[PDB]
């Protein structure tokens, strides 16, 4: 009689493959150096959120203009995974859905980790950030 709820992603369960394959000191060195080389851009890691049903992202490392908006970055990722116009896409930054009106520079200055990278997870649904 019970509706079993077993298909929703655990909050905070996202694990970035980028951090499992690159130690902190290597990431921190590259992030700090790329921020000095391009002070008007931010380095971003984008990977698929848990239990998402959506196409794979071939590349995870992006150097984005700080003045690019989140809505424009949604546009970029949609094309790279070849989403249909009707397909949904959500971003998550520290377990929260960022405002589409924010700039990537605003997200970076608020949410970048100590390795100087900004981490974004993506999914076809919003559950992971609610």
Author numbering: -12 to 117
Question: What does the literature reporting this entry say, word for word?
Answer:
We identified one main LIR motif (PCM11955–1958:FVKV) in the C-terminus of PCM126. To elucidate the molecular basis of the PCM1-GABARAP interaction, we determined the crystal structure of the PCM11951–1964 LIR motif bound to GABARAP. The structure was solved in two different space groups P212121 and P43 at a resolution of 1.55 and 1.86 Å, respectively. Both structures displayed identical canonical LIR interactions comprising PCM1 hydrophobic residues F1955 (Θ0) and V1958 (Γ3) deeply bound to HP1 and HP2, as well as three hydrogen bonds formed between the main chains of PCM1 LIR residues V1956 (X1) and V1958 (Γ3) and the main chains of GABARAP residues K48GAB and L50GAB. On top of these canonical LIR interactions additional specific contacts were observed in both PCM1:GABARAP structures. Within the core LIR motif, V1956PCM1 in position X1 formed a hydrophobic interaction with Y49GAB of HP2. Notably, the adjacent C-terminal region engaged in multiple interactions: (1) a salt bridge between E1959PCM1 (X4) and R28GAB, (2) a large hydrophobic contact between L1961PCM1 (X6) and L55GAB, F62GAB, L63GAB, and (3) two hydrogen bonds between the side chain of Q59GAB and the main chain of P1962PCM1 (X7), as well as K1964PCM1 (X9) through a water molecule. However, in contrast to M446ATG13 and M359ULK1, the side chain of K1957PCM1 in position X2 was partially disordered and the aliphatic part formed only limited hydrophobic contact with GABARAP. Most of the residues interacting with the C-terminal region of the PCM1 LIR are only conserved among GABARAP subfamily proteins (R28GAB, L55GAB, Q59GAB, and F62GAB) and LC3C (L64LC3C and Q68LC3C). Thus, these residues may be critical for stabilizing association of the C-terminal region and mediating selective binding to the PCM1 LIR motif.
